[PDB]
């Protein structure tokens, strides 16, 4: 609750962004927050399959209604709860908060860096970050540069 309050609201773009490290982020973020109503579609499909089986083999309707409920019950039991999804949601929300803070810093100083950015794009043809390039440069200096 505390982390979600700080974030406020989550948009699908950020979820798809974090999909890189957790492909099941949507499947986990649905089981933590009351976003949308979840129907046990897999359970209902298995129930319909059992219904077709019973219809073929002429079972009483009580049996097929019970065999429709049962897979649905299993799906619901395996869906709800699942507090591990809450841990994964916490991790995603931490990532999202850091990303949003950095994005706000980007927007705040965008005008200040316009000129430097224009100068930089014309000299470096790489899109890699400045931090990574500078760490690589520091390692290159530490290795090849003569101590003298």
């Amino acid at each position: 609750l505390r982390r979600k309050q700080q974030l406020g609201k989550i948009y699908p773009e950020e979820v798809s962004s974090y999909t890189q490290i957790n492909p099941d982020i949507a499947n986990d973020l649905n089981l933590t927050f009351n976003a949308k109503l979840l129907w046990p579609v897999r359970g209902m499909t298995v129930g319909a399959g059992f219904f077709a089986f019973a219809h073929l083999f002429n079972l009483p309707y009580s049996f097929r209604l019970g065999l429709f409920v049962l897979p649905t019950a299993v799906e619901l039991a395996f869906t709800w709860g699942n507090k591990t999804s809450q841990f994964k949601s916490i991790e995603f929300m931490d990532y999202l908060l850091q990303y949003r803070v950095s994005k706000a810093l980007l927007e705040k100083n965008a005008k200040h860096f316009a000129e430097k950015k224009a100068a930089y794009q014309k000299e470096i043809n790489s899109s890699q970050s400045v931090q990574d390039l500078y760490n690589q440069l520091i390692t290159l200096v530490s290795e090849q540069a003569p101590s003298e």
């Binding site: 609750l1 979600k4 406020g8 609201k9 989550i10 948009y11 699908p12 979820v15 982020i25 949507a26 973020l29 649905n30 089981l31 933590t32 927050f33 009351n34 976003a35 949308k36 709800w80 709860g81 809450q86």
Partner: protein, 59 residues
């Protein structure tokens, strides 16, 4: 073969004190156990619920 049928006794017997006295005890015990099990299931169910989400939120 036409299957035979019967008239369930409890549908046509005048209510008696013995039925009441015994089924009262049986229902007392049934209620106790059902209440305990249902309380356990209720705690489990409510704790299984998700956390409240924002307004008009996807994922």
């Amino acid at each position: 073969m036409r299957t035979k049928l019967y008239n369930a006794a409890y549908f046509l017997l005048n209510n008696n004190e013995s039925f009441g006295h015994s089924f009262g005890i049986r229902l007392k015990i049934v209620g106790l156990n059902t209440w305990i099990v249902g309380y356990a299931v209720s705690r489990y169910y409510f704790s299984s619920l998700r956390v409240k989400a924002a307004q008009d939120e996807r994922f």
